[model samples]
Target: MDSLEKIKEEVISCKKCKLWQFRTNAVPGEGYPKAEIMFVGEAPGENEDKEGRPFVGAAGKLLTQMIKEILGLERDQVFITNVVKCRPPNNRDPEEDEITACSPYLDRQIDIIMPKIIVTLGRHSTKYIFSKMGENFSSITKVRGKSYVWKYKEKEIIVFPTYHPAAALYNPNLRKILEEDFKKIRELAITP
Candidate 1:
């Protein structure tokens, strides 16, 4: 079996963290297996946890629209997953220990997919990737809407940090910025 499939099985059964005890299902994430672009979110929310899928709620709707309209790609065209496969209770930010426990799955996914571009959808995911890239990260505001070149096993990958779609739910200005960022992402997607 492919490594992604192997990781999915492991994620479902993972008990390395206490979050598993509270979860209904572990969302290992899904999309085209060989997609050129990948989106990484923080963690599963209520709808995502209940449905065992990534980005399937109000935030998901906004992400889908941006992917379709700005990036001109269907949601399935780009792989979507989270730094943590399970949801935190009541939708709180994932704890640091949980992220540490769950991050290897993400590492393996990136190794297998080898996506040309990785769009980190929020602070946690972006910080995680930034750490891997050996870049210091303070806040999403300082880094969003920009692309950083990251090397994985000597292969260069473009890491694009952006505000989470969830953040756009309550703020119109952030929504506009997110759209603009996606437009830049579109340009990056088309580059050779």
Candidate 2:
């Protein structure tokens, strides 16, 4: 089996953290394995948890729209996953220990996919990626919409931090910002 499938099997049967007790199914993430762009979100929500897929909730719909309308690509063109594979109870934020336990899967995914650009959906994911790059992170607001260059195994990847689609579900302002960021992502994706 390919490495991605192997990781998926481990994630599905993983009991590494307490989250597996509550999860109906683990979201191992999906999309083009060798995608040029990869999207990282916080964790699964109610819909996602039940469906055992990443980004199938309301916020996911918004993200899909942006990918379709702004980026001019299908959802299958880019990989989508989360820092924590399982959902937190009552959709609460993932605890620190939970993230620490689960993020190695994300790191492995990055190593295997080696996407050219990684678009982090919210503060938690952005912070995690920043930490890996040895960069300091303060707030998403201060750094959103800008691109940071990161080198992994000698290949340079663009890290674009942006607001979570959930945050934009009710706020038109944040939605606009997300749309704008997607435009930049499109430009970045097209460049050689």
Candidate 3:
């Protein structure tokens, strides 16, 4: 089996944390394993928890549109996943313990899929990924659109931090900034 499929199969049975109990289906991220770009969100919401796919809800729809306009990528062309695979009760921010428990799976995924550049769509996802790479991370408000490099299993990859799409549902001001962030991703693509 190819590396991506291998990871997908393993992710389904992952019982690393207590989240498996609440989940009806485990969401392994989807898209090209060889994809140059990967997108990470905070966690799945109700729709994604039920559907067992990342980024399928309303925020996901906005994300899809922004990605297409900025990067010209179709859904299958870029990878999408979340920091916490399981939905948090009431969509609360992930507790520190949960982030600790679930992070290894995301770390392993990097080894398996080997995406060249990752665009993290929230502070949580950005902090988690950056911390793993040994950087002192901060909020997306400070780091968004800044590109950094991280190494996993001996391969160095670039990471771009951005705001989560769900914010636009309540905070319409984010729409333009979100579009601008995607543009940075597209612009960054040319050299990297």
Worst 10 residues of 3 by lDDT: 1-10
lDDT of 1 by residue, 1-192 (tens): 558889999999999998998898899989988899999999999999899999999999999999999999998789999999999988788999999999999999998999999999999999999999999998999999999999788688999999999999999999999999999999999999
TM-score of each: 0.97, 0.98, 0.91
Model 1 scores worst on lDDT over the 10 consecutive residues at: 148-157
lDDT of 2 by residue, 1-192 (tens): 348898899999999998999999999999999999999999999899899999998999999999999999999989999999999988889999999999999999999999999999999999999999998999999989999999889799999999999999999998999999999999999999
Stretches of candidate 1 exceeding 4 Å from the true structure: none
Best by lDDT: 2
Let me know the TM-score candidate 3 reaches against the reference structure: 0.91
Report the number of backbone clashes for model 2: 0
Q: Would you list the C-alpha lDDT of every candidate in the order shown?
A: 0.94, 0.95, 0.83
lDDT of 3 by residue, 56-160 (tens): 889888999888877898989988888888887777887898888777767767777788889999999999988877888756799887889887677878899
